[PDB]
Amino acid sequence: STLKGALSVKFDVKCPADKFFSAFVEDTNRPFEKNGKTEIEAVDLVKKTMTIQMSGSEIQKYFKTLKGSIAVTPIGVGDGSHVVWTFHFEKVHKDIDDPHSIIDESVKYFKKLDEAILNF
Amino acid sequence: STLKGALSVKFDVKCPADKFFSAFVEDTNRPFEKNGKTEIEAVDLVKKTMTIQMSGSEIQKYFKTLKGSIAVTPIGVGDGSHVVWTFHFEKVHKDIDDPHSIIDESVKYFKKLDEAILNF
């Protein structure tokens, strides 16, 4: 297919994994755009994994289907967490860019989430 | 009402709160009895609160409605957690005892949950 693909980023956060992952799961109660909808397709609160389907009038200008999967794992003990965040997508048509901009924005979102819960 | 009431216990566990609460939410995927059904009525992954309705052949010999509510709160900074566990119920008839045996069993369940996941 020229339309289906995925893009994934791995980066580290200061927060312990269970706290970071729970905070994220809870924050998905807020749609990511005005007209948006987020549906949990898979979730494991012990493995700290989740896949969500995201939709909305804006995101669908670019992707017929957008899913996001997270996996959060402890680095050590009081050392913070590794985060893997993956977009799985089908583009509207083949000249849509891979979601580099949006995934960089997802990283910023996650880093702000980390700072929010670390300092609260 | 002669049938409606609640019974609540507060006790401490050694697990940190997010890890403990998440392990519990995840464990509700297993029914609590062979013919049991658990439904999540409310859940907050940041406040570490949840209400579940429990039904099944056994339960409904005693209660028309049995719900259970947890709140998990940090004691300090690695010092473990306070757990409040409440049964809200309507008895099948006025002569049914308040769920003392049942709740003491919940407490045992929760302390074994604590040891299981602390040591993993």
- Domain of B91: which CATH number? 3.30.530.20
A99 touches chain B (CB under 8 A): no
Chain Cα centroid distance, residue A35? 18
B contact residues 42-71, partner A, Cβ 8 Å cutoff = 44-46, 48
**Number of independent structural domains in chain B:** 1
Determine the 3-state secondary structure of B84 from DSSP: strand
B28 touches chain A (CB under 8 A): no
Is the dihedral angle over the CA atoms B28, B16, B114, B105 positive or is it negative?
A: negative
Amino acid identity, position B94? K
Per DSSP, what are the bridge partners of residue A4? Answer: A90
Nearest to B62 by CA among B3, B2, B1, B107: B3
CA A91, A93, A98, A99: dihedral to nearest 10 degrees? -50
Cβ A38 vs Cβ A32: under 8 Å: yes
Please tell me which of the candidates B23, B44, B46 has its beta carbon nearest to residue A46.
B23
Say how far apart CA B116 and CA B15 lie, in whole Å.
10
Q: Indicate the SS3 state at residue B100.
A: helix
Q: Do residues B80 and B16 touch, judged by C-beta distance below 8 A?
A: yes
Cβ of B26 within 8 Å of Cβ of A19? The answer is no
HSE-CB for B74 with a 13 A CA cutoff: 10
Q: With the CA atoms of B108, B71, A78 and A105 taken in that order, what torsion angle do they form, in degrees rounded to the nearest 10?
A: 140
Token output for B23: 């392990």
Cross-chain CB nearest to B26 (options A16, A26, A44): A44
- Give the residue numbers spanning the domain of B55: 1-120
